[PDB]
Amino acid sequence: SRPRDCLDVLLSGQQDDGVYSVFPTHYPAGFQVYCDMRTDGGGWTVFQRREDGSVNFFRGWDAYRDGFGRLTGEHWLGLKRIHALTTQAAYELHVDLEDFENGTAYARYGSFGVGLFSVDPEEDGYPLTVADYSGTAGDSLLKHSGMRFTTKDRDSDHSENNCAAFYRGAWWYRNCHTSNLNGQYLRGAHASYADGVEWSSWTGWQYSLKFSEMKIRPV
Amino acid sequence: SRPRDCLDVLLSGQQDDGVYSVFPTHYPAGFQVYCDMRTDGGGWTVFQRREDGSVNFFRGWDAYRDGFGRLTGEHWLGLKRIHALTTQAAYELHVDLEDFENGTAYARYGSFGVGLFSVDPEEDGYPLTVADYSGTAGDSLLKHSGMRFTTKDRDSDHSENNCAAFYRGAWWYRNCHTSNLNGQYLRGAHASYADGVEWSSWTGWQYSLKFSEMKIRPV
Amino acid sequence: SRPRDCLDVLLSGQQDDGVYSVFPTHYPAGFQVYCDMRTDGGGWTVFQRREDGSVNFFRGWDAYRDGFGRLTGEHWLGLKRIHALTTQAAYELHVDLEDFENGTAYARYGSFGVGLFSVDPEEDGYPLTVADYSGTAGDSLLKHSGMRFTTKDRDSDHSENNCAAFYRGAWWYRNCHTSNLNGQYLRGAHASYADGVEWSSWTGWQYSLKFSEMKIRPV
Amino acid sequence: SRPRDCLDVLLSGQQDDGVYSVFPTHYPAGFQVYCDMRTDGGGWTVFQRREDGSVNFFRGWDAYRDGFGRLTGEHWLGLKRIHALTTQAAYELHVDLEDFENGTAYARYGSFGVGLFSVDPEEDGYPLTVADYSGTAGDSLLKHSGMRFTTKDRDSDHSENNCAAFYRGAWWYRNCHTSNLNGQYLRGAHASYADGVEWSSWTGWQYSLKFSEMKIRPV
Ligand SMILES: *[C@@H]1O[C@H](CO)[C@@H](O)[C@H](O[C@@H]2O[C@@H](C)[C@@H](O)[C@@H](O)[C@@H]2O)[C@H]1NC(C)=O
Ligand SMILES: *[C@@H]1O[C@H](CO)[C@@H](O)[C@H](O[C@@H]2O[C@@H](C)[C@@H](O)[C@@H](O)[C@@H]2O)[C@H]1NC(C)=O
Ligand SMILES: *[C@@H]1O[C@H](CO)[C@@H](O)[C@H](O[C@@H]2O[C@@H](C)[C@@H](O)[C@@H](O)[C@@H]2O)[C@H]1NC(C)=O
Ligand SMILES: *[C@@H]1O[C@H](CO)[C@@H](O)[C@H](O[C@@H]2O[C@@H](C)[C@@H](O)[C@@H](O)[C@@H]2O)[C@H]1NC(C)=O
Ligand SMILES: CC(=O)N[C@@H]1[C@@H](O)[C@@H](OS(=O)(=O)O)[C@@H](CO)O[C@H]1O
Ligand SMILES: CC(=O)N[C@@H]1[C@@H](O)[C@@H](OS(=O)(=O)O)[C@@H](CO)O[C@H]1O
Ligand SMILES: CC(=O)N[C@@H]1[C@@H](O)[C@@H](OS(=O)(=O)O)[C@@H](CO)O[C@H]1O
Ligand SMILES: CC(=O)N[C@@H]1[C@@H](O)[C@@H](OS(=O)(=O)O)[C@@H](CO)O[C@H]1O
Ligand SMILES: [Ca+2]
Ligand SMILES: [Ca+2]
Ligand SMILES: [Ca+2]
Ligand SMILES: [Ca+2]
């Protein structure tokens, strides 16, 4: 009746990929998400998808807090929703990647959260918790652990520049990044430095991936 | 106890037309609506009514998001409420029309929604989903399918002008419209082009209707 | 467990006057009110009290929407809360008055509501519904029936002036008033015209009352 | 399932100190707090902690309303949350203090609340209710009883200056204080007057304490 996430949806007997209502502990109004019911037995709540460059990801603080795009296509679920999900239980993160040569890879993180113990996660900049990498894509996220989220209009990074403005995205920037999955949809190899859909451990700092999906499941 | 819409109110044993409390899945505070318990067996949730020009419909974004007028008279229920209703289940739309010669007609749409898969339906402009026309008024809505909602202060249409400013209303404007039920209450035939309560397939682009009601019921 | 008003509190077995939690149908977070468990068998939800001039009632729109003062003393519960109460059921209004000569009187209204059928009661100005007077104070409210609420910063009255600015209060002003229980605490007879705690049918337009209480109970 | 505070968490069978979900009567979304399950049998809800000066406490009104820092470290839970907790039942306050010589002391108050009967506790400035001192630190809070909360940008104190600006903190200032646990983390004895983490009855007006924790439990 009130699944808290896509794993509750799966265990209630819904086996199809698609859009479902979930109701996190501290977000009782609930909201709709895309559930991946296939990957590693299923029950994954999607919070980011790139697939075709139809949606603008070069967005400000309010858009990254509140979410944008469509659940059936390219979207960012919103940091307020990702906080409501990742604080209610211990989640793992799955990242699926595809290049423009139909190569695929994945990274799995045994631990993932945003603003986990922040009294005001927005004020506190939704800081990243991430640990325990496995998979085929290589690790491009551990270096970001403990970093606040930065947008073009709200700088909490460890550059004297704004990493989000400079690398044309929004991420838990350090000085500045090994991943940038919210970067410009530049479609494969590019001359500009690290400002595309980058997962550096797989395809370097000058290759914008075709497809990315970031999704969570209780450990 | 907690009907999600006017069909739940009807099936609970309330047979009179009137104002009732409903509680959509993702709007658990609930709100009051006018229920039509008569049309095609009843259970219709009203979200728009024109009948006498007593209410100003030439309103900005905030008014069309939040609603205006009175449930017992002319009103717009508000796109945030229409989103909360149409995303909780698959709805049909019924449109009742009356001209100033006591002629009536209706359009039925087997599928209707606003911002159905939008992460932020407001940001995304509450885009229209509508399909499967039947009735006596003719179809004046299918051409609007997939269009964002436009007001005089927020332009998401496919004109290089603001369709809402120009046609003095608020609608899912393309370039620009075949219907304008939120247009000025100009009372029948008028010289100005398409800026009245227009349903073009029935009464052309220069006839402001006396009465309109837009209402929804689960398929 | 979840009384909707002070009558539910009374019928649950709480017989003492005081502050209690209530949970209106469309305000499920609930809030605290002062319950009068004595008047005419009890179960009255207080929304206004004057007794000593310790609280400033010459306040703007936001203060009259959101409430001010303290539940144990002078207060205005707030029009958003009075709307949440009066729309969930059919309420009567009781007004208790006291002059500075220890005279008391009361007015009872068989019907009372604010913004009863308004889609956006705030936008719509929380219009007064009131009918069916009885009691000792005389009727000073029926002439206000159907009038929007006016403050010094938001004019919806039927003067070409701002009635709230002019009569130094906040009320459902026509042109302008027969009651002004939110007026200045001027302490009895005064030279200024109708700008005190006025109930004109009892003590005229130049007498500021010592005590007023406005409270509601389901019919 | 829905503990209202850390005492409900304890009595449900959770004996470890740590972060838990609580759901106050008028804050039904709930939020996370740090529970002290050890002090005097346990069940204490933490709302303030100083331990190392890593968090800036010289913050404005919005930060003191909404909370800041992290539940596992230095934080202020936020006056809106402290109001939601202290109005749902009768609470006692426990204050644990430590100096830089590993001395500890405590103050216990048999009665504690903020904005207890305020219709709008924010407007009303979250006024302090506190009574019935016992413990080893001495009383440095009773003189503040009945005072509104003051920040550098919102002055409700009884100085003709802003006590919060002057003593570089945020507190229920009179003219001005005997305690300032939200003051600058100045680390022990200091030349500046009363602008550190001060508990005057224990360590005077020129000694910034190493550790403070303010926490509540139903009487
Ligand atoms: C990558 O996978 C997709 C599967 O959807 C295929 O469309 C691609 O096939 C290529 O494009 C289609 C239109 C067809 O002409 C086929 O012959 C092509 O090989 C596939 N391969 C590549 C390299 O993109
Ligand atoms: C349209 O229907 C309404 C039903 O409410 C009628 O009021 C109209 O009747 C006309 O107006 C009334 C006042 C009366 O004089 C009658 O004789 C008229 O025919 C009716 N017809 C039209 C053409 O508007
Ligand atoms: C009005 O009622 C109140 C009841 O609380 C009384 O205080 C008033 O009594 C008057 O004031 C007190 C202090 C005492 O001196 C008494 O002798 C007075 O009559 C009472 N009467 C008036 C006229 O205010
Ligand atoms: C205060 O208590 C803490 C307990 O955590 C101790 O760290 C302090 O011990 C002192 O510092 C440590 C690093 C060690 O060198 C020890 O020998 C010291 O006495 C303790 N004492 C003081 C005075 O701070
Ligand atoms: C996008 C980004 O941050 N790229 C950095 C690059 O700037 C530089 O690091 S740098 O901190 O010295 O600038 C480089 C060598 O160290 O490593 C990369 O990961
Ligand atoms: C209100 C409105 O939009 N009216 C259009 C009109 O502008 C014009 O279309 S137009 O796109 O060429 O301008 C016309 C012929 O095509 O069709 C109408 O539906
Ligand atoms: C406060 C107020 O409104 N007082 C009016 C007064 O202004 C005048 O009415 S007036 O509409 O002509 O001005 C008078 C005689 O009619 O009646 C009073 O009730
Ligand atoms: C921080 C603060 O307020 N310190 C006051 C100090 O200012 C002065 O009091 S004072 O009201 O006269 O200024 C003093 C003697 O009375 O007592 C202290 O508690
Ligand atoms: Ca920077
Ligand atoms: Ca346009
Ligand atoms: Ca006026
Ligand atoms: Ca001051």
Known binding-site residue numbers of A for Ca(2+): 155, 157
Residues near C188 by Cβ (< 8 Å), separated by ≥ 6? C99, C100, C207, C208, C210
B31 and C26 within 8 Å at the Cβ level: the answer is: yes
Atom 16 in ligand 5: which residue has the minimum CA distance?
A: A175
A19 and B117 within 8 Å at the Cβ level: the answer is: yes
Q: In sequence order, which ranges of chain B are alpha helices (DSSP H)?
A: 6-11, 61-66, 79-86, 163-166, 200-203
Neighbours of chain C (3+ CB pairs under 8 A): B, D
- Tell me how far the alpha carbon of residue D217 lies from the centroid of ligand 2, in angstroms: 71
Instruction: Tell me the CA distances in angstroms from C46 to B70, C19, C58, C102, D119, one per residue in order.
Output: 27, 10, 20, 21, 12
Pairing of strands A44-50, A31-36: antiparallel
Query: Is C29 touching D (CB cutoff 8 A)?
Result: yes
User: Could you give the angle at the alpha carbon of B74 between the alpha carbons of B73 and B76, nearest 5°?
Assistant: 125
B157 is in an annotated binding site: yes
Query: Is D31 touching C (CB cutoff 8 A)?
Result: no
Sign of torsion, CA D198 D200 D201 D207?
A: positive
- Please work out whether the CB of residue B217 comes within 6 Å of at least one atom of ligand 6: no
- Please work out whether the CB of residue D20 comes within 6 Å of at least one atom of ligand 8: no
Instruction: Tell me the CA distances in angstroms from D84 to B134, C63, C76, D32, D116, one per residue in order.
Output: 53, 20, 20, 13, 9
Which of A120, A122, A123 to substitute to test the interface with D, most D CBs within 10 Å? A120
Q: List the beta bridge partners of residue D153.
A: none
- Tell me how far the alpha carbon of residue D125 lies from the centroid of ligand 11, in angstroms: 33
Token reading at C76: 């205005």
DSSP state string for B139-163: -SSGGGTTPPPBBTTB--SSSSS-H
Count CA atoms closer than 13 A to A185's CA, side-chain side: 15
**Which residue from B28, B30, B70 is facing C119, i.e. has the nearest CB?**
B70
How far is Cα C114 from Cα C85, in angstroms, rounded to an integer? 9
Query: Is A14 touching D (CB cutoff 8 A)?
Result: no
Instruction: Tell me the CA distances in angstroms from A127 to A115, A119, A124, A145, A168, one per residue in order.
Output: 5, 12, 7, 8, 20
Q: Which ligand is nearest to the CA of D166?
A: 8
Instruction: Tell me the CA distances in angstroms from C27 to A19, C24, C61, C85, D125, one per residue in order.
Output: 29, 5, 20, 9, 23
D68 and A124 within 8 Å at the Cβ level: the answer is: yes
In the chain, the amino acid numbered D141 is L
- Tell me how far the alpha carbon of residue A73 lies from the centroid of ligand 1, in angstroms: 20
SS3 state at B188: strand
How far is Cα B72 from Cα B70, in angstroms, rounded to an integer? 6
In the chain, the amino acid numbered C191 is A
Shortest CA distance to A95 belongs to which of A104, A83, A110, A108? A108
D72 and A124 within 8 Å at the Cβ level: the answer is: no
Query: Is B87 touching A (CB cutoff 8 A)?
Result: yes
Resolution of the coordinates, Å: 2.0
- Please work out whether the CB of residue C202 comes within 6 Å of at least one atom of ligand 7: no
Task: Give the residue on C whose Cα is nearest the Cα of D123.
Answer: C68
Q: Which atom, in ligand 5's list, is nearest to the CA of A174?
A: 3
**Which residue from D21, D29, D71 is facing A119, i.e. has the nearest CB?**
D71
Q: Which atom, in ligand 8's list, is nearest to the CA of D178?
A: 19
Q: List the beta bridge partners of residue A213.
A: A49, A96
Q: List the beta bridge partners of residue D19.
A: D34
Pocket of ligand 5 (CB under 6 A): A 167, 175-178, 194
Query: Is A146 touching D (CB cutoff 8 A)?
Result: no
Instruction: Tell me the CA distances in angstroms from C42 to B68, C4, C17, C46, C213, one per residue in order.
Output: 36, 15, 9, 11, 14
Which of C27, C114, C120 to substitute to test the interface with B, most B CBs within 10 Å? C120
How far is Cα C154 from Cα B112, in angstroms, rounded to an integer? 38
Distance between alpha carbon D187 and the CA centroid of its chain, in Å? 19
Q: Is the peptide bond before D163 cis (omega within 30 degrees of 0)?
A: no
Q: Which ligand is nearest to the CA of D98?
A: 4
How far is Cα D108 from Cα D199, in angstroms, rounded to an integer? 13
How far is Cα D117 from Cα D136, in angstroms, rounded to an integer? 31
Please report where in the chains the tokens 């339906």 appear, as a residue: B121
- Tell me how far the alpha carbon of residue C18 lies from the centroid of ligand 7, in angstroms: 38
Element (H, E) at D8: helix D6-11
Which of A32, A34, A74 to substitute to test the interface with B, most B CBs within 10 Å? A32
How far is Cα A85 from Cα A95, in angstroms, rounded to an integer? 17
D77 and A28 within 8 Å at the Cβ level: the answer is: no
Other beta carbons within 10 angstroms of residue D139's beta carbon come to 17
Query: Is B117 touching A (CB cutoff 8 A)?
Result: yes
Q: Which atom, in ligand 7's list, is nearest to the CA of C177?
A: 3
How far is Cα A164 from Cα A154, in angstroms, rounded to an integer? 9
How far is Cα A23 from Cα D16, in angstroms, rounded to an integer? 27
Q: Which atom, in ligand 7's list, is nearest to the CA of C180?
A: 1
Q: Which residues of B touch C87 (CB under 8 A)?
A: 32
How far is Cα A195 from Cα D31, in angstroms, rounded to an integer? 37
* Distance between B147 CA and the closest CA of chain C, angstroms: 25
How far is Cα B39 from Cα B217, in angstroms, rounded to an integer? 11
Query: Is C124 touching B (CB cutoff 8 A)?
Result: yes
In the chain, the amino acid numbered A43 is G
- Please work out whether the CB of residue C108 comes within 6 Å of at least one atom of ligand 7: no
Eight-class DSSP state of B128 = E
Shortest CA distance to B120 belongs to which of D218, A60, D71, C88? A60
Contact criterion met (CB below 8 Å) for D93 and D133: no
Task: Give the residue on D whose Cα is nearest the Cα of C34.
Answer: D117
Contact criterion met (CB below 8 Å) for A104 and A90: no
Shortest CA distance to C75 belongs to which of C55, C53, C97, C98? C55
Please provide residue C110's backbone torsions phi and psi, each rounded to the nearest 5 degrees. Answer: -65, -20
Mutate to test the pocket of ligand 8, among D163, D173, D175 (most ligand atoms within 8 A of CB): D175
Residue A145: is it exposed, middle or buried by C-beta count within 10 angstroms (0-12/13-18/19+)? middle
Contact criterion met (CB below 8 Å) for D140 and D107: yes
A69 and B27 within 8 Å at the Cβ level: the answer is: no
- Please work out whether the CB of residue D136 comes within 6 Å of at least one atom of ligand 8: no
Other beta carbons within 10 angstroms of residue C199's beta carbon come to 25
Contact criterion met (CB below 8 Å) for D71 and A119: yes
Please report where in the chains the tokens 């190392």 appear, as a residue: D52
Shortest CA distance to D194 belongs to which of D180, D209, D214? D180
- Domain edges within chain B: 1-137+211-219, 138-210
Residues near B199 by Cβ (< 8 Å), separated by ≥ 6? B95, B97, B105, B107, B137, B138, B140, B179, B181, B209, B212
Q: List the beta bridge partners of residue A22.
A: A31
- Experimental technique, in short, is X-ray
How far is Cα D109 from Cα C188, in angstroms, rounded to an integer? 43
Query: Is C55 touching D (CB cutoff 8 A)?
Result: no
Shortest CA distance to D150 belongs to which of D130, D124, D131? D124
Q: List the beta bridge partners of residue D24.
A: none
Distance between alpha carbon A100 and the CA centroid of its chain, in Å? 20
Q: List the beta bridge partners of residue A113.
A: A129
DSSP state string for chain A: ---SSHHHHHHTT--S-EEEEE--TT-TT-EEEEEE-SGGGS-EEEEEEESSS-S-----HHHHHH-EEBTTSSEE--HHHHHHHHTSS-EEEEEEEE-TTS-EEEEEEEEEEESTTBSSTTTTT--EEEEEEEESS--SSGGGTTPPPBBTTB--SSSSS-HHHHTTS-B--SSS-SEETTSB---EE-SSSS-BSEEHHHH-SSEE-SEEEEEEEE-
Q: Which atom, in ligand 6's list, is nearest to the CA of B205?
A: 1
**Which residue from B26, B27, B119 is facing A70, i.e. has the nearest CB?**
B119
Shortest CA distance to C69 belongs to which of C94, C32, C115? C32
- Tell me how far the alpha carbon of residue A16 lies from the centroid of ligand 7, in angstroms: 70
